[PDB]
Amino acid sequence: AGAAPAGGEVRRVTMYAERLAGGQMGYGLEKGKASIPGPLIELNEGDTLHVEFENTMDVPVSLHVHGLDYEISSDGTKQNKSHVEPGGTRTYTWRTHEPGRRADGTWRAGSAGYWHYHDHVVGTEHGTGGIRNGLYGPVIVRRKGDVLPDATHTIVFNDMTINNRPAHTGPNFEATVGDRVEIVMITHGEAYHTFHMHGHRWADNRTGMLTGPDDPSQVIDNKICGPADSFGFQIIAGEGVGAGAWMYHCHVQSHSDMGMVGLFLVKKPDGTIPGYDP
Amino acid sequence: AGAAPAGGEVRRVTMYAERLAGGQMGYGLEKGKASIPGPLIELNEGDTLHVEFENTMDVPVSLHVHGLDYEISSDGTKQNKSHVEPGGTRTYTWRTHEPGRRADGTWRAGSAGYWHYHDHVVGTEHGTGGIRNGLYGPVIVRRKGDVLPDATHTIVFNDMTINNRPAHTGPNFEATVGDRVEIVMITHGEAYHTFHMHGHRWADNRTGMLTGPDDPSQVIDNKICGPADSFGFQIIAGEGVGAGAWMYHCHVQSHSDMGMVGLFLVKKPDGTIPGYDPQ
Amino acid sequence: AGAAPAGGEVRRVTMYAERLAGGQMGYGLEKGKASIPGPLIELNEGDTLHVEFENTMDVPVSLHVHGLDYEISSDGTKQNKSHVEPGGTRTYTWRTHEPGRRADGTWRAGSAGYWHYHDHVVGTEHGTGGIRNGLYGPVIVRRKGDVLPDATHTIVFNDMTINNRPAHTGPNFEATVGDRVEIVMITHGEAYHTFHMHGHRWADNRTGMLTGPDDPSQVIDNKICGPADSFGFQIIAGEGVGAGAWMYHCHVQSHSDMGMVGLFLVKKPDGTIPGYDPQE
Ligand SMILES: [Cu+2]
Ligand SMILES: [Cu+2]
Ligand SMILES: [Cu+2]
Ligand SMILES: [Cu+2]
Ligand SMILES: [Cu+2]
Ligand SMILES: [Cu+2]
Ligand SMILES: [Cu+2]
Ligand SMILES: [Cu+2]
Ligand SMILES: [Cu+2]
Ligand code: NA
C-alpha cells in the first residue's frame, strides 16, 4: 500500500484472555472471539496503547510485551504483581517512541520493529503453560515512512506446532502474484527452529527489505530462531518465480517430517495455481 | 584480487546423482566423479543456469536450491512433481537477478549471496535421508564488482559430521600467508552448531567483508547456524597472525570433542607450517 | 559520556589459573584472587597485551582468545604446544589493529568488538572441563570514539548456569535510572539459549547502538546464542520505562523455569526501587 504516518495517537483496546476448545487459551479483542495467535496490534512510533484487559479464565493470567515501552506496573509478571487474577481487570499501558539524537550526541533507537506479547504466569512464573496453550500474539510498530503491505500473516513456531495447529494442518496463506505480503515470524517454547520459504527471500534487517544499494545485510531464505525471537519482512508474492504452492517450513529435518509445514498459495490473476492439486 | 563482472549469460551443466560407498550418495558433474559436498556452482547476477540432471540411483532423487529464482517446476519436490525417477533425466532451470529500483521506487534485492542445493525426496518428502547421505552442495551468486578470491572451500556441518567425513578426519584446507580465501559454510540435518575459526574473523553481512567505515555489522569469529543455513566470507590467510595450522571447528563442546574439527593449514612463502605435527 | 581514545599502547598483566572451592577453576590477575567469570580485559584498537601467565594447578591449562590477533604460539592449544604445564609459566601475547585500507584499497576490519577468552585443554583438547569449571572471561576491544559506559556487567550462560552460579541465585546487577550500562554476553557449553531483557532493547550490531538514522540493524530484546558466541550492548537504565527490578533471563522456557534468571535492579534517583519487595 502506501507509507506509515507519524505516530502520537493515544489508542485504546479491550483484550480478553479466554479458554478455547481442547485445553487451549487465547487472547481476543471481543468476548468469545479469542484466537491463536492473538490479534495483531499495529502502532506507529509515538503511539500509546491502553489495553483494557479482562481475565475470563479460572486461573491467573498476564500480558508481557517485547520491545515496547512500559513501566514496571505493566511488566505482566507475578514478581511485581502485574498479573490478573481470575475474573479480574487491569489496564496495561504500552508506549512507543521515535528515534532521535540525545543531547550528548548519541542516537536513541526507536520502538519500530516486529514484536510480540504473551502470558507470563500460567503454569509457571514464566508463562510456560500459557504460551503452550496459545497465549501469544504479534505486535508491529512502524516508523514514519515504512512501506505498508497488502496483507500480513503471522507464523508462530510454538514448540513442535505452527500456531498451535495439529501437525500437517497448515496454516496456508493465499496471495496473488505481485501482492506485497508481510510475514511476522515468532518462536516460542523449548526448541530452536529454522524458518525457510521456497521461492522467496528477504533481507536480514529491521524491515526485512534492503534500504537501497548501500545496505550490506545478508539476503536469506532460511533463519535460525529460538524461544521469544521475533522478526518480520515483506516479499512481493511470486516475484521472479511465478505462481505456485510455495512451501514454507521449519528446516530442522525431523520437524518438517513431523508436520511443521505450510503453503504460501500464490495465484495467477486468473485465480489458478499451476501444479497444485489439493 | 579481481572483480566479478556483470552477469546475464545463459549456461548449461550436467549433474548426476550417484550412490557412493557405504550408503552415501552424492552429486557430480561427470559420471563416477560424484563428491560430498557436490560441485561448487558460481554465477553472476543475471546468469541463467540449465542443470541437465540425471538420476543414476535406484530410488527417486531431486534438486532443490536456496536463494536463486526458479519456477515451481524446478522446486525439486515430489509435492510439485519435480523429482526425478530412478534412471530419469530432468532439466532444472535456475535464474538470478540484479538488484534495482522497482516501478514504484522500492528497492528489489538481488540474488547475490552464499546459497546451496540439496535433495528433497530421498527417505522423506523433505529429503531427510538424501541430505544425511550426502546430497548437498554450494552455490555462490556474485554481484558485479564483488571481490574475487584466490580459492574457495566449502564446509558443511551435516548433523555431527563435516562434509560426511569420518570423525576427526578433517577436511583440511591449504593456503599461503596472504592468500584471499573464501569460505562457504552450510548446515544440514537435525542439530544447531556454532562455527569457529582460530586466528581469523569476518563481518556478519552478505559478503563477510565490511563495505567501509559506515558498515556497523558485528565482526565475529563464532556463528550459530541451524539446518539449511548458509553464509560465507573471505579472509586474508594469516593476516596479522602468521602461518600455522589454524583450527576451525564447531564450538558446541561435545561436537568438537567427537570430531567436528578441521585445519586451515596456512604456509609461509617457503611452504612450511611452524609447529604442525599431525598425529 | 566518555569516548575511547586511539590505541597503540603496549601493556602487560599477570594472570593465574587457580583452583577454586567446589572443584571449580578460575582466572585472576592476582594470586589468590581468581574469579568466575575471569577478569574483564579492556583494550583500545592498536594496543598490545602481554599476558604473563602462570598455571598454579595440577593439570595442564591454556588461554585461548577470540577475535584478537595472536600468533600460533599464543593459540592456547596442545596440538601446537601453546598450553601451560602444571606449575608452568608462559607469556601469551594478544595484538589488536585499527580498521583501514590495505595497499590494494580493500577495507580491513578492525579488532573492535565484544570477545572472550577461555581454556582449551582441561578435560578435553577443546577445554570442555576447563570451561565447565569456570575458565572463561570477557575481553572488550574499543574503537576510537566508541561510547564509554558508567558500568560493565558480564553475563555468561555456561550450560545451565549463569556465571557458574546455582539456579535462582542471580547474579543481580544494580544501577540508577539514567546510568549507561554495558552488558557483555557470552555463551558456553552444550546448549543454545536466548537472552532476553525486560524493559530494554538494543541494536543487533557491533556496539549494540545504532550509528544514526541510516543504520538498518534490527532492534531486539531477545537473541539466540550458542557455545562461544559473544555480543554486547549498552542501554540507558530505565530509559522510557522507569525504575524497578527488571528481569533478564534465558527465554528457553524450561531454562527460565529452572532458574537461569537474574535482576537488573534499577533504582530511582532517590535510591528506592518501586515494586521490589524480596522475601527476607
Ligand atoms: Cu520474562
Ligand atoms: Cu523446527
Ligand atoms: Cu517473552
Ligand atoms: Cu523445502
Ligand atoms: Cu556442532
Ligand atoms: Cu533446503
Ligand atoms: Cu578451538
Ligand atoms: Cu537457556
Ligand atoms: Cu572458544
Ligand atoms: Na546485520
Residue numbers in the entry:
A (entry chain A): 40 to 317
B (entry chain C): 40 to 318
C (entry chain B): 40 to 319
Publication text:
Laccases (EC 1.10.3.2) are multi-copper oxidases that catalyze the oxidation of various organic and inorganic molecules (e.g., mono- and di-phenols, polyphenols, diamines, aminophenols, aromatic or aliphatic amines) with the reduction of molecular oxygen to water. Substrate oxidation occurs near the Cu1 ion (named T1 center), and electrons are then transferred via the Cys-His pathway to the Cu2 and Cu3α-Cu3β (TNC), where the reduction of oxygen to water takes place. 2D laccases are homotrimeric proteins, with Cu1 ions of monomers lying in one plane at an equal distance from each other and forming the so-called equilateral triangle.
Based on our structural analysis, we propose that the side chains of Met 199 and Tyr 230 can hinder the access of organic substrates to Cu1 ion. The activity of the Tyr230Ala variant toward ABTS and 2.6-DMP was 4 and 2-fold higher than SgfSLwt, respectively. Met199Gly and Met199Ala mutations led to a shift of pHopt for 2.6-DMP oxidation by 1.0 point, while Tyr230Ala mutation shifted the pHopt by 0.5 points. Met 199 is located in β-hairpin turning into the loop (203–212 aa), Tyr 230 is in the short loop between two β-strands. The side chains of both residues contact each other (Met 199CG–Tyr 230CZ, Met 199SD–Tyr 230CE2) and form a side wall of the substrate-binding pocket. From our point of view, substitutions of Met 199 and Tyr 230 to residues with short side groups (Gly, Ala) can increase the mobility of this region due to loss of contacts strength. Indeed, in the crystal structure of the Tyr230Ala variant, double positions of Met 199 and Glu 229 side chains were found unlike the other structures. The residual activity of Met199Gly and Tyr230Ala mutants after high-temperature incubation and its optimal temperature (Topt) for ABTS oxidation decreased significantly compared to SgfSLwt. We suggest that decreased residual activity of Met199Gly and Tyr230Ala variants at high temperature could be explained by increased mobility of the Cu1 ion environment.
